[PDB]
Design an enzyme around this catalytic site. Structure first.
Site, short mmCIF file in Angstrom:
data_model
loop_
_atom_site.label_atom_id
_atom_site.label_comp_id
_atom_site.label_asym_id
_atom_site.label_seq_id
_atom_site.Cartn_x
_atom_site.Cartn_y
_atom_site.Cartn_z
N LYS A 149 1.99 -3.71 -4.53
CA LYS A 149 0.77 -3.26 -3.82
C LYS A 149 -0.07 -2.32 -4.89
CE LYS A 149 -0.68 -1.10 0.39
NZ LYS A 149 -0.05 -0.29 1.71
N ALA A 181 -8.75 -3.14 3.04
CA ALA A 181 -9.96 -3.10 1.95
C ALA A 181 -9.44 -2.57 0.66
CB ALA A 181 -11.23 -2.44 2.42
N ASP A 186 1.55 1.65 13.26
CA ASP A 186 0.86 0.25 12.89
C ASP A 186 1.91 -0.90 12.82
OD1 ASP A 186 -1.34 -1.18 12.32
OD2 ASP A 186 -2.02 0.08 10.80
N1 LIG Z 1 6.57 -5.91 0.68
C1 LIG Z 1 5.80 -6.79 1.02
N2 LIG Z 1 6.14 -8.16 1.01
C2 LIG Z 1 5.50 -9.19 1.51
C3 LIG Z 1 4.17 -9.11 1.99
C4 LIG Z 1 3.42 -10.15 2.65
C5 LIG Z 1 2.64 -10.28 3.48
N3 LIG Z 1 2.03 -11.37 3.83
C6 LIG Z 1 2.01 -12.45 3.33
C7 LIG Z 1 1.69 -13.58 4.09
C8 LIG Z 1 1.85 -14.83 3.16
C9 LIG Z 1 2.64 -15.02 2.25
C10 LIG Z 1 3.46 -13.88 1.64
C11 LIG Z 1 3.01 -12.54 2.20
C12 LIG Z 1 3.83 -11.40 1.77
C13 LIG Z 1 3.75 -7.62 1.97
C14 LIG Z 1 4.32 -6.59 1.66
C15 LIG Z 1 3.51 -5.42 1.72
N4 LIG Z 1 4.24 -4.10 1.33
N5 LIG Z 1 3.17 -3.13 1.66
C16 LIG Z 1 2.44 -3.82 2.27
S1 LIG Z 1 1.14 -3.10 3.30
O1 LIG Z 1 2.46 -5.10 2.19
#
Ligand SMILES: Nc1ncc(-c2cnc3ccccc3c2)cc1-c1n[nH]c(=S)o1
EC number: 2.7.11.25
Length: 299
Positions: free
Chosen positions: A84, A65, A170
Site C-alpha cells: 500500500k 484517493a 469502515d
Molecule cells: N492487503 C490487501 N490485500 C488485498 C487487497 C485487494 C483489494 N481489492 C482487490 C480487488 C481485485 C483484486 C485484488 C484485490 C486486492 C487490498 C489490501 C489492502 N490492504 N490495505 C488496504 S486499504 O488494502
C-alpha cells in the site's frame, strides 16, 4: 532512521510518528533487506494482481484517493505481500498502529513500513483472491454459503478487535479481502481504540451507505457501530447491490434506519434473522460479534 532495518513494534510506531534514500522498519523476517536497503527489481519485484472474475490482471488496486495497493514479491523468500502506497502528507499513525500491535488470523498482518521519496510503502498480508466488493461487482449476488463463510471470518476479526476495545470504523465489501483458506479485514485508517465505555467523535467517519445511525448522529458510539456496518455489508453481499442505492444519503439514513426493505425476497429466514439482528437501531439491543457467531445461520 537512515536505512531499512528489522525492528520491534515500538521501533515501527516510533518511525511512523517521525534525500533520495529509503528508510523503514521491517517487523517480519519475510521481507529481506540487503545492506540497509529494499529497492524494486533488486530486493522486491512488483507483480500484478489477478482479476479472477475478469480473466485479466491489474498492476494496482485504487484505495480512495491517497492510496493504491500493489502486489509485491520478496525475490529472496518468494513471499507475496500487498504493498500500500500512502503519501507522507496524507499519512496517519492509525494506518500502522492497529495492524502492528494486534495480530489475528482475520486481520491483515503488517510485515513492514518503508518510506521512499514522498510515499510510505506498507508491506502487509496480500488478499490474492481479491475484495468482497470485486466478487460482487464482477459476479453479482453471492450464494448463501459464501456469505456464511465470509461472515464467520469477519465476525472472528471483529470479536478480536472489539476485545481490544477497537472500532474499525469502515467495515464494507471493499475492506474484506480474501485468500484460499480465509478472509482478512483491511484498512485501519479510520480505526480508534476506546479509552472509555462510549466513544465521542469530533468528525463523521466512514462510508455513508454502511454508517450506523449513532455514528451519523455524532452523539456517541462503541464497537456496536461495526455490527451495523456488517449488516449493511451483508445486504450488499446478498443482493449484489449496496443498501439505499436502488430505492434512492446522510439525511435518508438518519430518518430511515435500518434498510430492512433492501433485503432480497430470495433471502433465507435464518440469514434474514441474522441481518435484521445486526441492523438493530438501538446499539444496546444490537448483538456483539461473539453473540452473532453463536447464531443458527452461521453455525
Ligand atoms: N492487503 C490487501 N490485500 C488485498 C487487497 C485487494 C483489494 N481489492 C482487490 C480487488 C481485485 C483484486 C485484488 C484485490 C486486492 C487490498 C489490501 C489492502 N490492504 N490495505 C488496504 S486499504 O488494502
Amino acid at each position: 532512521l537512515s536505512s531499512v532495518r528489522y525492528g520491534t513494534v515500538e521501533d515501527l510506531l516510533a518511525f511512523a510518528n517521525h534525500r533520495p534514500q529509503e528508510s523503514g522498519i521491517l517487523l517480519n523476517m519475510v521481507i529481506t533487506p540487503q545492506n540497509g536497503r529494499y529497492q524494486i527489481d533488486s530486493d522486491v519485484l512488483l507483480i500484478p494482481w489477478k482479476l479472477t472474475y475478469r480473466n485479466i490482471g491489474s498492476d494496482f488496486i485504487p484505495r480512495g484517493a491517497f492510496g493504491k495497493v500493489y502486489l509485491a514479491q520478496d525475490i529472496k523468500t518468494k513471499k507475496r505481500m500487498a504493498c500500500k502506497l500512502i503519501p507522507v502528507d496524507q499519512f496517519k499513525p492509525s494506518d500502522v498502529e492497529i495492524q502492528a500491535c494486534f495480530r489475528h488470523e482475520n486481520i491483515a498482518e503488517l510485515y513492514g513500513a518503508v518510506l521512499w521519496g514522498e510515499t510510505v510503502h506498507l508491506f502487509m498480508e496480500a488478499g490474492e483472491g481479491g475484495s468482497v466488493l470485486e466478487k460482487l461487482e464482477s459476479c453479482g449476488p453471492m450464494r448463501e454459503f459464501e456469505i456464511i463463510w465470509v461472515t464467520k471470518h469477519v465476525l472472528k476479526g471483529l470479536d478480536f478487535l472489539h476485545s481490544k476495545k477497537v472500532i474499525h470504523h469502515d467495515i464494507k465489501p471493499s475492506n474484506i479481502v480474501f485468500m484460499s483458506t480465509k478472509a482478512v479485514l483491511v484498512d485501519f485508517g479510520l480505526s480508534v481504540q476506546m479509552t472509555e465505555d462510549v466513544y465521542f467523535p469530533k468528525d463523521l467517519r466512514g462510508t455513508e451507505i454502511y454508517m450506523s445511525p449513532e455514528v451519523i448522529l455524532c452523539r456517541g458510539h462503541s464497537t456496536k457501530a461495526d455490527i451495523y456496518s456488517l449488516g449493511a455489508t451483508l445486504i450488499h453481499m446478498q443482493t449484489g447491490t449496496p443498501p439505499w442505492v436502488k430505492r434512492y444519503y446522510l439525511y435518508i439514513i438518519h430518518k430511515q434506519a435500518p434498510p430492512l426493505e433492501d433485503i432480497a425476497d430470495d433471502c433465507s429466514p435464518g440469514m434474514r434473522e441474522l441481518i435484521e439482528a445486526s441492523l438493530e437501531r438501538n446499539p444496546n439491543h444490537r448483538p456483539r460479534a461473539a453473540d452473532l457467531l453463536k447464531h443458527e445461520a452461521l453455525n
